[PDB]
Design a protein around this ligand. Structure first.
Ligand SMILES: [Cl-]
Ligand SMILES: [Cl-]
Ligand SMILES: [Cl-]
Length: 163
């Protein structure tokens, strides 16, 4: 476990993370994809061997000894708001199980379903709150990765408001 488990946010490419494992914002088919998924494919391509897994699940594949947790959020283009919200919660719960099983002291994590799976809506708060519900019972240091300057400020504010 971490000595004083924390949340932090950084605005940079998650493929350059300083944590003991990474969460990929994967597609269900284990394809290279776009955005976070394509950065993860370039950095850890070996982790895409048999990485396909259903929506609402996470599947870990090692790249050497470095764990890549492939977490499949719902595409809100296809899911109803109700069923998508349930699957997005479930994906983060499966991430927390994997992080616990691996015994890591730190994890790098993107906001699932906030990019091309957002169905054209701002889901910062929805996705971050499901991240917190799952990860609050874990003792890993959690480092959230984002790319937008305004999102960095809002995630930082949300972390600080609980402390
Ligand atoms: Cl960067
Ligand atoms: Cl996405
Ligand atoms: Cl972002």
């Amino acid at each position: 476990g971490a000595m004083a488990p924390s949340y932090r946010v950084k605005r940079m490419d998650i493929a350059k993370n300083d944590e003991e494992c990474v969460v990929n914002a994967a597609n269900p088919r284990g394809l290279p994809g776009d955005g976070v998924c394509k950065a993860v494919y370039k950095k850890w391509p070996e982790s895409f061997k048999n990485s396909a897994t259903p929506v609402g699940t996470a599947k870990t594949v090692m790249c050497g000894t470095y764990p890549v947790i492939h977490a499949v959020g719902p595409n809100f283009s296809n899911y109803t708001e109700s069923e998508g919200d349930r699957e997005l919660a479930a994906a983060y719960r499966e991430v927390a199980k994997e992080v616990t099983r691996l015994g890591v002291n730190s994890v790098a994590i993107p906001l699932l379903s906030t990019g091309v799976y957002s169905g054209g809506k701002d889901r910062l708060t929805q996705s971050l709150n499901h991240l917190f519900t799952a990860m609050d019972s874990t003792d890993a240091d959690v480092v959230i990765y984002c790319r937008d300057k305004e999102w960095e400020k809002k995630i930082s504010e949300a972390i600080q408001m609980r402390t």
